[PDB]
Design a protein around this ligand. Structure first.
Ligand SMILES: *Cc1c(COP(=O)(O)O)cnc(C)c1O
Ligand SMILES: *Cc1c(COP(=O)(O)O)cnc(C)c1O
Lengths: 953, 954
């Protein structure tokens, strides 16, 4: 049926042939191993027939890789790049190009994920410790985490920390916090059951001993620098905590919150060398007094020892987190903003305290110059003491001032009272000042104004305390040195430039160069999130196009991009369900059914949304126990708000009758939340919206190629059926309302579409793959997983399988029997795989003591075979212990991993060879050998001796 | 101004570029017993040749504004769809290669693979390039690149002359015009007569023809059978040389199959940008019997000390550094990085993907051809690959008016006909635009429907390729993007580079290649313009050239700069030829003698021989300087026939000669010109200028002094600065005119494109504009401080062989390791290989003095890095003392067994009289967290040349 022209002149290229690892030969052979005739036969035996697509996906024709950038350029060039002095928590900065090139555009930094396996992850661990040390020094507090999602959510996390600490149900918020910060904190308080009150400090009475805490901002949203010493003292006298939203650059010359008694300091690290990104991604900082550290949200690097006593790094106090404590965790947060936290650390490293003081003083002096010129021109300043931000009452018409600003393509903040906000930044020079003085009608140039001339350095607020004195911040100031340091850290970390990372539940697929390119384009990276929308029409088209495609892949009617992680998606989705229920008079319904196999984020998100959790048992075959499910639905039927399911299941298995589960919940007045992290087994074959699901988050950093970033950034957009659409998140600066009926749940992220600048990656994957390619990717993810399971099944027990004996995109290897037969633990197998050149699969979840393996469609048959052969050879090592051929205390498994220092030493006292230690199979060669940089990590020691800043060098 | 007090400069790029800060500099000065930098300079650079006033440059540009400043220039270029052809064809550069190789400092900061055991990655990749070229051309051995197509064609002519010594050479006039011009220029100064003849007008029967050059497909697009022409040449003892196209050869029977002796061309369309001329790797392949006359580098397979199969540069005595004026060419820096880009293209696509692209391009051309004929236009040739020659059936004016409307360029032939060359980028939409431009009233869909699926063009002809290519596993393994990224990383990790440690290569200037400088070279406004566009499309490039020329004029004291020469050696050749054209026009053409000190770089005598000069060596005295006695005697001897001298300042041993103006005056008084080799300008910039002390012309190495990346062996740029008396004789180009006057009397054309590799010039523009006059001076000052500091630290452990009058060196110095041969049976090579174990690429070896090391740190490395290198050398001196004094076996010790591979240090078997720790971590700064492994044991230099294998073994 093809046109004659298509036969003579086919498509230049098919991106799917690059993205998908196995070719025709690989696929036939894998099918042969499975005893199957075709891919359709595998799918027919795996995915239940009654939930499969009735017609293929309706998508646009695929775009050739050689045209994707020009196609996307026709969109991005519709944005306008103005000079934005809007402020409001986003300030332009000068991103060092050497960090941009050697870290952000380096696949050796961005393809790895959360540092789960410390011995092959010491590089990013050290860098995040640098971030923590930077934040503690600048804020003046004791401990800081390894990033939050953004400023407003960090402020919300402070509120929740205060509630956890003292259980009081009142919380004060200064109305001079940024508007988006207020909205996120109010939304978080609403569903947690805390009452917020908007009050200026002089209206705050703590004397009832009923206030959990207070949030204020320094400098505040109007630019003012205030002394909060007395306010903090009052709070404390009545048992309340004090929380300060602040600015790392301002704090380079301002006495910091730690020095006026603050308990929690938080803000964005964006202006420390990360692009505006039309909202993100940016690492928020969050730091506390030492006495609050047990309640810290998120990850936090700590110092510990390895098996030799060497000082080394590891994620610390991990029982705080969702994966151990579930609904009792300190937060739902999982993917955070790791890569961007590391960008901001490297900024601070490259500049040192001296270079950061230089920038800060320059910015403040530009602001002081601007202020003097505006006063001389007859305009009034509302505050005399500021860092970078002025609040101006125009001495003439505001209209005529703004007409002049438009002529020079400059944006100010327009306050509702008719006054103007101007926030200067690192990028501001003489020419920009002269433009600004002209906008305000001032005859005199910046040079002239300077001549007749203070601020922070002449005030009682000037900083007198040191910061960034550790050698890491005083060593890498030449470009040659910084490049060498970034490389040293990269090379410590195994990543997708080395080998498959078959992390179950993570989807470690290809992050392609063509998809990645656009994120550093100026038309995407350099737009302030709150510009007038006629400057961001390119972003508007991007959002429309990506929404429509995501709607078609999922069977949903509307997508909301605000949630900036999967867990944020779960929280937003659950809150939207509750707002739906509330509006329709069913607000008494708060019970959420959660199978015990759910990801830990699920119960943590449900708790954060104010729901009551009812666990549902899983049966011996791995499926939701239907007896217990029916009993829990009957028990809670009057108060049932929702169920959280995952399809296919978190063990990789397709449930046989998932529509029946959806129908049972619907019949009892609940909504169905479907966790979309496993959509790599669905795309182009079935759709959660077709079988009864009402809302799902998607993980664009798993299924849709956003890079894993060493732990972030992510995007967790939610798709909803149209009955939920009126209740989707809104934003107080940029309105997201589409319909007449709108009744928004609130605001869940600081920026209206979250981390907007990374969405082109997923748009690009989708547009290049098309309908056929997207289907083929899922088909191959399933083929690759089943092929590995088949190869391993006579050596390890494949724990759970579907009705006809097939898995989905991942499977569990049950290593538990080896505990009794050989004193071997799953951790021994994980560490030993490092010696075979592999980052371990997912460990001990959903089943403790086992491994969950997800290869993805991006890895080829030869790579799958290397991994299977490694496992087979490890099975034989275990058999050597089982059968008494090697010492059960000192053998390769128990001594793994084998560091370079171990295998190169003069000593050697092992009952096995160096060759067996370090090159256990012939594919592990000196030419490709990746070294674990340390011996086995000590998980206990670090938590007993807590050290979460850079130790002395 | 008080504005600057309140509002200082955002940043100073010099503080990033220059490694040592204030504390480092004070301490280094203290070690030298000096009070300031001015005191060091005052004691080093002779007072009478120093700048009379400071450099007049623009105010320095902050690093945070350099890209926006450059964008205001680059955006003046217009990016049209160019179907001009003429040896440059747009292609779809794989973004993954672009990101993970071209924009990867682990690929681009290293230089020529002199130290094989820490360079096996790029060596393997270049072997891949060679294998790709041999398979596609059908010839036996290929080199590891040439500079461009026209210079490769010139090298073929010179190879033919070397082979049979005949003074006649035939050139088909259907070769590309720029190729013809480079070949004619080369021949003119070599003394060979070229004759422009069609095959039917070529008579070889006199047995006086060196060889013949023809092109397949030719510049008009035609595919011709040259079987009979090659046979005729051979019957009379002549060679046959074929300029060709690697993409065409994926479906055309290749030159190896029709008896051709040398095949050559550009690899540009195998995934490298147009670059407004470059950089691009040329290919050059020959019959096995001609390999001893091969120009350039060539990778070979050999063994290491354990018998393992490994890679090294082969047959090295052919090259300038060993054979000097007797070498097979002057070429030194080539196009390594770009050769490796084209190999990775071929790897990523395989033969199946290359056939797909080739067939697609040919079918698009077949479709275009059918539409144009149906519209009443005439085609001159019915058998072609991608290129049509069209006689318009209507007015050419109206055709071109429509083409301008769609921003499309054609080639305009002198005869009023039009050339159209399609390429990988061409799709249905572009065909429909083209058909509309030609008035067709049809579409590409419609045209395809009336053709059917009949076999036409190349596949329906006796020319269809039937021989296989790229059957080795390397071309059939890395087709997923995941696999290609992993392969590029594997190779990258084998190679020590500036992402690891200082590479203190004397005469190489291994300074910082900054991210801000590098960014612009992949901007579309620079990368994606065809070199021969109408000039109103390249006004941005014109301003770039003007600005960089003016700054280079001011740094050197010259009056005009020419950017055509695309390496330092090309600069030397162009500069020498310009001198001769000057002398010829003034009635002094009898003067051909060129005085060359014996300490000159090997390129100097090779370039002089290439320019047709007679070479007279000049001796060096016991202090390292030009021997004054012998110089005066050689000037006296040759005074009637003296054309030039080639000097280097400071000298190639790092020493400032005390009276360099006197040398310039002596040559001038006897009717000669002064050529000054500019490779050591990093000891001059902002302190002194070769033009102020009597030099008439210099090449500059932008890839040494001015931050173009070393690229594993290329690319380079070697622009020449000249005094105004030489300016009328500068190179021209036959497609794009470089004449500034009616007075012009050009030497000829030395490179294929008018300004050479234009797209990499922004790097040097950027360095200069960010540094300013003060920063540039500080860089030079610090290059000299760092070199003197290291010499001072090492002088009680090693003899510093040569120094200036007051005891100071310039930017580099020589360590005399020769006495260790008698005292310990230690060779300079032992010290080089042992340094690898300490985490360092060796310095420059055995040049200018055999058996010694020459060390150049540059200003970009800080005191701590210099100290690690000095401490490594001190610890090595102690290892030698252990041998001298009988404390360790003199045959089996760390020096003799170096380098120590991972396989060596990790093995079950040891049995050396020293530890693994001493082997692999000899000092505490060498740690497991930063340990770079030599990938192989010491390489056997003899074995590989005795068992020549220059393609991938099975
Ligand atoms: C990763 C994951 C999530 C949560 O995503 P984050 O972006 O990490 O917050 C939820 N459920 C499952 C099953 C996952 O694998
Ligand atoms: C590098 C160098 C050259 C030649 O420059 P290329 O760009 O390699 O051709 C000439 N002379 C000296 C002294 C050099 O260091």
């Amino acid at each position: 049926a093809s046109r004659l022209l298509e036969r003579l002149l086919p498509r230049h290229d098919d991106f799917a042939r690059r993205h998908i690892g196995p070719g025709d030969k690989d696929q036939r052979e894998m099918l042969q191993t499975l005893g199957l005739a075709s891919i359709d036969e595998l799918i027919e035996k795996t995915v239940p027939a009654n939930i499969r697509l009735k017609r293929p996906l309706k998508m646009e024709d695929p775009v050739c890789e050689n045209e994707i950038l020009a196609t996307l350029h026709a969109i991005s060039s519709k944005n306008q790049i103005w000079r934005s002095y809007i402020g409001m928590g986003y300030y332009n900065c000068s991103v060092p190009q050497t960090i941009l090139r050697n870290l952000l555009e380096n696949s050796g930094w961005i393809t790895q994920y959360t540092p789960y396996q410390p011995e092959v992850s010491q590089g990013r661990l050290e860098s995040l410790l640098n971030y923590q040390t930077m934040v503690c020094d600048i804020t003046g507090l004791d401990m800081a985490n390894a990033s939050l999602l953004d400023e407003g959510t960090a402020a919300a996390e402070a509120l929740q920390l205060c509630y956890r600490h003292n259980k009081r149900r009142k919380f004060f918020v200064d109305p001079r916090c940024h508007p988006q910060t207020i909205a996120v904190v109010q939304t978080r308080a609403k569903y947690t059951g805390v009452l917020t009150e908007l009050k200026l400090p002089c209206e705050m009475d703590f004397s009832g001993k009923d206030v959990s805490g207070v949030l204020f901002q320094y400098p505040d949203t109007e630019g003012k620098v205030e002394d909060f010493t007395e306010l903090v003292e009052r709070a404390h006298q009545s048992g309340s905590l004090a929380c300060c939203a602040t600015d790392l650059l301002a704090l380079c010359i301002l006495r910091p919150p730690g020095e006026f008694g603050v308990d929690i300091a938080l803000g964005s690290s964006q202006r420390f060398g990360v692009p505006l990104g039309y909202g993100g991604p940016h690492a928020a900082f969050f730091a506390v007094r030492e006495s609050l550290v047990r309640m810290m949200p998120g990850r936090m690097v700590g110092v510990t020892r390895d098996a030799t006593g060497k000082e080394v790094y590891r994620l610390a106090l991990q029982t705080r987190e969702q994966h151990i404590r579930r609904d009792k965790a300190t937060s739902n947060i999982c993917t955070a903003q790791a890569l961007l936290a590391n960008m901001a650390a490297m900024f601070a490293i490259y500049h040192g305290s001296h270079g950061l003081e230089h920038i800060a003083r320059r910015v403040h002096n530009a602001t002081l110059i601007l202020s003097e010129g505006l006063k001389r021109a007859g305009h009034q300043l509302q505050h005399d003491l500021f860092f970078d931000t002025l609040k101006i009452q125009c001495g003439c018409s505001v209209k005529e001032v703004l007409g002049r600003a438009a002529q020079r393509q400059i944006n100010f903040r327009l306050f509702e009272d008719g006054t103007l906000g101007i926030s200067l930044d690192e990028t501001v020079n003489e020419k920009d000042l002269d433009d600004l003085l002209w906008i305000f009608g001032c005859e005199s140039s910046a040079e002239l104004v300077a001549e007749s001339m203070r601020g922070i350095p002449g005030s009682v607020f000037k900083r007198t305390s040191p910061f960034l004195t550790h050698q890491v911040f005083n060593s890498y100031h030449s470009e040659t040195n910084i490049v060498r340091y970034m490389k040293k850290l990269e090379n410590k970390d195994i990543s997708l430039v080395h080998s498959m990372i078959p992390l179950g539940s993570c989807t470690m697929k290809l992050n392609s160069s063509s998809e990645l390119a656009p994120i550093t384009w100026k038309e995407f990276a350099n737009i302030h999130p709150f510009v007038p929308l006629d400057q961001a029409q390119g972003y508007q088209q991007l959002f429309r196009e990506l929404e429509k495609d995501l709607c078609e892949l999922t069977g949903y009617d509307q997508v909301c991009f605000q949630p900036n992680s999967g867990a944020q998606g779960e929280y937003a989705g659950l809150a939207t369900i509750r707002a739906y229920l509330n509006q329709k008079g069913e607000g008494h319904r708060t019970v959420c059914l959660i199978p015990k196999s759910a990801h830990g984020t699920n119960p943590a998100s449900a708790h954060m949304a104010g729901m009551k959790i009812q666990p549902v048992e899983v049966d011996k075959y791995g499926n939701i126990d239907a007896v217990h499910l029916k009993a829990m639905v009957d028990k809670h039927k009057e108060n049932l708000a929702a169920i959280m399911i995952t399809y296919p299941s978190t063990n990789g298995v397709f449930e046989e009758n998932i529509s029946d589960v959806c129908d049972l919940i619907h019949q009892h007045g609940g909504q169905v939340y479907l966790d979309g992290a496993n959509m790599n087994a669905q795309v182009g074959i079935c759709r959660p919206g077709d079988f009864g699901s009402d809302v799902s988050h998607l993980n664009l950093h798993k299924t849709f190629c956003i890079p894993h970033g060493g732990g972030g950034p992510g995007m967790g957009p939610i798709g909803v059926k149209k009955h939920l659409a009126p209740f989707l998140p809104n934003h107080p600066v940029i309105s997201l309302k589409r319909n007449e009926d709108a009744c928004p749940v609130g605001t869940v992220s600081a920026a209206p579409w979250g981390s907007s600048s990374i969405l082109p990656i997923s748009w690009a994957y989708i547009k290049m793959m098309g309908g056929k390619g997207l289907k083929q990717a899922t088909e191959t993810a399933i083929l690759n997983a089943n092929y590995m399971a088949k190869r391993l099944e006579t050596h390890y027990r494949i724990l759970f399988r579907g009705a006809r004996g097939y898995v989905g995109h991942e499977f569990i290897l049950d290593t538990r029997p080896f505990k009794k037969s050989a004193n071997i633990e799953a951790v021994d197998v994980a560490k030993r795989l490092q010696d075979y050149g592999f980052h371990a699969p997912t460990m001990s979840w959903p089943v403790a003591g086992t491994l969950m393996v997800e290869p993805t469609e991006s890895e080829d048959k030869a790579e799958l075979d290397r991994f299977c052969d490694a496992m087979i050879s490890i099975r034989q090592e275990i058999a050597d212990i089982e059968e008494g051929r090697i010492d059960p205390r000192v053998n390769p498994l128990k001594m793994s991993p084998h560091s370079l220092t171990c295998v190169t030493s003069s000593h050697w006292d092992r009952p096995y060879s160096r060759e067996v230690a370090a090159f256990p199979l012939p594919f592990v060669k000196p030419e490709n050998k990746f070294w674990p940089t340390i011996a086995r990590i000590d998980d206990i020691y670090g938590d007993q001796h807590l050290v979460c800043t850079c130790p002395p060098m």
